[PDB]
Subunit: 261 residues, 7 copies
Amino acid sequence: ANQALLLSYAVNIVAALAIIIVGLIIARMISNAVNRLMISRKIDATVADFLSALVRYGIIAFTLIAALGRVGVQTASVIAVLGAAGLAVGLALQGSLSNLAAGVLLVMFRPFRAGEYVDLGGVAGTVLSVQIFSTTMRTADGKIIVIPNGKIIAGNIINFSREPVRRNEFIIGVAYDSDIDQVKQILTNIIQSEDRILKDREMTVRLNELGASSINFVVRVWSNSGDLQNVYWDVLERIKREFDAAGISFPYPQMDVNFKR
Amino acid sequence: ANQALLLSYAVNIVAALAIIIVGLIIARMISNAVNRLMISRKIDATVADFLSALVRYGIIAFTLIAALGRVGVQTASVIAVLGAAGLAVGLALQGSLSNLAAGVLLVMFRPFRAGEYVDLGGVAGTVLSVQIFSTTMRTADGKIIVIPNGKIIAGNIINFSREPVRRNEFIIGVAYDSDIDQVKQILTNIIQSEDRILKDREMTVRLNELGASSINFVVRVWSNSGDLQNVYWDVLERIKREFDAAGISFPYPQMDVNFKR
Amino acid sequence: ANQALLLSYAVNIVAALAIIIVGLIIARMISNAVNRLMISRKIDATVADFLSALVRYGIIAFTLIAALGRVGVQTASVIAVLGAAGLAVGLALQGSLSNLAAGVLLVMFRPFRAGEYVDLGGVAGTVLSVQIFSTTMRTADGKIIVIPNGKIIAGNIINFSREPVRRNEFIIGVAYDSDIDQVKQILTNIIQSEDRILKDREMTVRLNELGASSINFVVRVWSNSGDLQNVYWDVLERIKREFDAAGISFPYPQMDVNFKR
Amino acid sequence: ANQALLLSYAVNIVAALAIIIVGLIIARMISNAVNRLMISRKIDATVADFLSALVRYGIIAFTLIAALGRVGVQTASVIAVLGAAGLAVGLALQGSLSNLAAGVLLVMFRPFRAGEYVDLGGVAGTVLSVQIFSTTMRTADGKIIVIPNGKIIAGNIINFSREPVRRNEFIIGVAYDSDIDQVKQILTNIIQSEDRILKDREMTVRLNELGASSINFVVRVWSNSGDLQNVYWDVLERIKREFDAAGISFPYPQMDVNFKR
Amino acid sequence: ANQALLLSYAVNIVAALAIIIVGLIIARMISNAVNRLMISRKIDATVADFLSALVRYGIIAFTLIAALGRVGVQTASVIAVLGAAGLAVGLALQGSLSNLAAGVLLVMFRPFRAGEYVDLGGVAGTVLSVQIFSTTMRTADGKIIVIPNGKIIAGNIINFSREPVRRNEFIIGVAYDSDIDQVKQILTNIIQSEDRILKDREMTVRLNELGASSINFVVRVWSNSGDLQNVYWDVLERIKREFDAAGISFPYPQMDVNFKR
Amino acid sequence: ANQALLLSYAVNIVAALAIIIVGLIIARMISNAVNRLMISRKIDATVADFLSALVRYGIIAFTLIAALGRVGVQTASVIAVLGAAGLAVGLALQGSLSNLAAGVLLVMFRPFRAGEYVDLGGVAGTVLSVQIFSTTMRTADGKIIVIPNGKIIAGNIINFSREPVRRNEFIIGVAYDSDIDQVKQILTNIIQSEDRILKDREMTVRLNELGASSINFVVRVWSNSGDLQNVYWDVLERIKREFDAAGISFPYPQMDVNFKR
Amino acid sequence: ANQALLLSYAVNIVAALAIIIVGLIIARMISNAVNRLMISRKIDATVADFLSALVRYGIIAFTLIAALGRVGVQTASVIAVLGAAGLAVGLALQGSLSNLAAGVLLVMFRPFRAGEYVDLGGVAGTVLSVQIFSTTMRTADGKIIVIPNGKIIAGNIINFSREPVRRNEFIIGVAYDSDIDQVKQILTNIIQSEDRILKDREMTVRLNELGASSINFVVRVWSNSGDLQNVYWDVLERIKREFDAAGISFPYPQMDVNFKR
């Protein structure tokens, strides 16, 4: 006969039923909307169905536990389990989301761009495109390498083509008895004769070290990045020919034997 | 004689009993439904029984603590322990869920497909299929390698067969006294004579470096990926035969001895 | 003389005492039940006693803090400390639970089975059994290796015996002056003479590379996995005998000396 | 003159004082009990005093913040700081607790037992005992190695003495001109003459590879683990003596010189 | 006919509608303001649109769940899921934010500055600029290297140009029979003759070690960082010339043969 | 004119002011007490001032937010920020606290003690003392090494001096033509003649392997740890002298040349 | 006409407006105070402006959400997002705070001090100063190395200059035919003749091992750390001179050839 008890219980049960039916209808409608939108554009059938099933399950679970709490049954354990599952999913997706964030940062900063020869953590090649999750680059041999963006952000990013001017380095080995002045002036003449070698930059021709069987001269020349290999090959061939003509001989690994008995 | 105290306590105890019995019945029914569904399709008996036991235990624990809270006993410690257990389970399953997410990403993006020769972190072979957790690929020797998808997403993904055109590289060593013009023109004629070598692409025949005992010429030719090994073998054999015929000798490791005593 | 204050305090203290005594009795009864069940089956005495003591301590702590909260003393700090302890225990057991999950996944997917020659992260051998936490495999030398399942799921899983057909690879070194046609046809005849070598599969006999002191021919033959070692040994012995008979000599590491003085 | 305000405040302050004094008395009594129990058995004085001080500080802090909350001052910041400290302590003790859990798992599963020759992550020796935190093993040289149990659970666990039968492997190098039939039959006779070599198991005597300066025969024999070293030494000595008697000479590293000038 | 029930429900529904419409209007206005501000300055179109969409979605979700809670439907599960998503996003952005923090610390402390030759974890070059996320440095060869600031803070930071004075080290190998006093005094005279070598600092010329085929003298000289390479090259060339003039011969790798047969 | 509204607001504001002033006074008094206690014993001035400032700031922040909450302003955001800061501090101090815990475990278990020759992760030396955070040990060369206790608990702990008896191992190389019986009996006589070599333990003198240029005999002798180096040196010198006297010659690296041309 | 509803709503809205305006004024005043204090001392302009903007944004956000909660709109989602952001910031700053804590520990314990030659994880040099985040040390070559304090606390800390006495080690190689007594007594006389070598410490001159081509004597001498290099060089030079005078010859890498054909 109480005016508050039975009335309150009836209100609670009616409100819980209304909440659960409204939530189920909204879940069905939102699943319909999301699947319509995903089919209307590019999507994968199986993955899309899996995602739609997961989101519908999540929404209906939310509605069910909300209705249970409105009824009066504590749902703290279910909330804690859902939080643990969410933390597990977040830890699982940490790698993919980190790759996505690294890709966004790479797009915004533009450390490298398409058609630029780079070196991303030990692999060198021309960059084709930079997608959201991973980039695509072609090695000089023609192999395609796909690198996750996280592994690019972590570690060095060497860019060969950013600077128009790069330097070559020659290691020329001649015999000990060879005339140092003669070899130095021959190398200097060879360097001067070339035109693709920049002249305003330093052109060092010095004795680098005293090796085990030969003395190594270091020759450093700067040139535009577009002619580096060609100038290196031409200078090396000219050095070989000029040393052959001038009598300077490249020494083979030399050892001396103290004969006994 | 109070109208609220005894009535409220009776309502609380009756509601708690109703909640616990309803929860137990629902747990039994849902266990029956889930085991029927899992038996009706592919499943493993022992693992399925373990999972059903765990889910039934979780549901009955939820119902019991909800009934205890309705009675009036605080369950915050039990909730915290359940949350800690959930976090432990999530940390344990982090690896498996990360592998699953990586597999989903690989399926969606399709960096590689079945029947495509790839190199996933140091191991090369033809891809057979890409499952949810791990892929299957066959090495050239015929060994089957199963790689977790997380270890594929992390690190480089080299695709040999994506580009139809790849480049070969030859390292040919000849003696110092050999005629550079003669060897270069012989190699050029050998390269020209072949038809499987693409002609629009660069075909470099230059002196690469001055080695310890020999001078190494670098020969680079581009060809379709389907004939790379065959063209390499044919060019190498032709180089051997032509150098033998023309008198150019491949030098053995050469050293000179300064005899004493 | 108040009808609510003293009555409420008496109800609170009586309810707290009832709750704590009921919890203690239930803890004793559940400890009795769990120890009876664990003794009735396989269990370790000391570990079982430790686990029973820990679970009884946890239950009595839950009951005590619930009674304290019913009395009216805040237990939030105790709850937080229990949560921190649970998180510590979960972090500690992360490794063991990850191993268990990996074992469950391995059992369900069956990447490898008993009596199958595999290679799990650098160690090769025949699989004996796959338990919940770790597998057991016997090396070819007869050593027993026990590997945690987490270390198996992480990293590659090479299966030698999955494919019935595998390929052998020979590296045969002959002298430079040897007749290439003669050695190639001799190797071809040796390969043809064998019956265990599959004929529908490719049988390549080509010149692989020009080594420092010898030219290495690559011979590749496919055969059933059950005869791989035997066919390799037989082919190698036949190659040795035929090269000895035909006059082709395997060259020792060859160097030439430019004598001086 | 209000009947509820002053009465409620007096009740609150009296209850807070009673709670704090009861908590302090209980903390003193429990510290007395725990130190009596720890002194009555094996314990370290300084570490025990440190632990008792920490637990007493924790209990008195709990009581103080409970009394403050009963008074009416919010303690949420103190609770959060205590939770952060607990998480820090848990992260610190993660290593020790993981070692303890690994030790418990090792005791329960018994991958290895006392007096069994094992190899735990690169170090080999006889196991003496397995404690809760770390095991003790003696190397063949006599050095004692103590390994944490976590580092044992992580990584492989090789057990030499689990299988009664193990296999030896011989690498015998003879000259190229040596008679293959003669050396094979000599090795076969040597193997047959021994009794400690199991005869039901495979006994392979084949040509393994063509080395740089010698041909290596592979001899594999199975025997009980208790005679492995002895049978290896005896077979090796017999091989040496028989090859010396039969004229087969073990070749030194052989090279040939092409003399010039 | 109740004066509180219907009135309270009407107030709740009207307040919820007002809250949701106000939140939607505020979200639209703040999106307009933020996009106006971002367009007015430097920004990327696609990334800016993505960020604006995400922030608008977050704000509207906040408003919707606030309205739902005002209505009376529990939103604890939605709150937990949002917290899990936030934790996942934080774990994903941990790398980028750590790089930003490292960059801020590097800017504040200034371990290195523009135009200063450094060595950041194995790569050496001149620093160009230090941005928020990553620095830019040019190698001596002319290659541009972009290093994340986190990888710079972690690990050593070697600064070559901080100290104006650096030391060179020479390893000179002479024959065993050479006169130690003569070579030491020759090296001392060579060191004294130079002017770019600092004289107040130590100038050690001692016998370092007895090598396999030569005795190595260690010569250490200090000089300004601006002349280090030049002084090294000049001293080395002078050492070569003076040893050639004085008769001391640099020994080749020397071995002695005990001829037999 | 309301008897509850204005009275309640006045009570709230007065209580908040009393709480904040009491908290400030208590913070000042506790800072005075803690600085008096820290000055009265060993402490560092700057670090102590920093810690006192931090603890006073924390206490005053707690009091301020408690007063704000008593006033009625929600402090949930401040609580969350304080929790995040506490978690950051805990993650930062994880390393130091782990080192402290490892040190406590090392002190309690005593794997090694002062004056005992050990090998903690690749570095060997005599232990001087074990502090709370790091141990101190002196290398045989006299260098002092300080190792964090965490790096000691992680990884192996080799104890040389725990076992009084250790084993030496000799690798003696003799020529192929040497008499095996003669060399074995000579080594046996040398071993027997020594007194510091334990006789009850095994003393193996066997042919270990057939090397490239020599046959290596393995000689194993057990002795007390206090005479290991001395017995090794004495046995080696005696072996040299006896082999010189008996005509057995230690062979140099031997190769044979097949002279051509 | 209700006396509680409209009055309560007016009180709520007025209190919310007062709270938000007070919070904004306090935020402006505290920003003014903090920027005045930071400008009055050493600070960086851009970083200081960034920090002031962040702290002002945080304070105004706190005030806004507090006002919203006072109004009655739930802010749980905003609180959760703020907590997630705080956790992300803490994870980002974990490295910097760990470095700071390690620096504090290093300052307090003083494992090394200024002007003391140390070796911190592979790099050796003299310590200049130890700052809060990173130390500064100068290598013997003169290069400045800045090491984060976390990388110093982790791993070994070798201190060369802590012990005044250190030991040198000589490896002297003589020919097999050399007289062992003669070389030992010569080395003993050389050691005795020096005065900087401590005599109370052990001075071992023994035969260490039988090398491939020479017998290596080990000479160990202890001396003060201030004369280690000088005594080493002097002893080595004296050894060379005395062996040259006494006829003992240091052997070159010796091999013997078995001539054939």
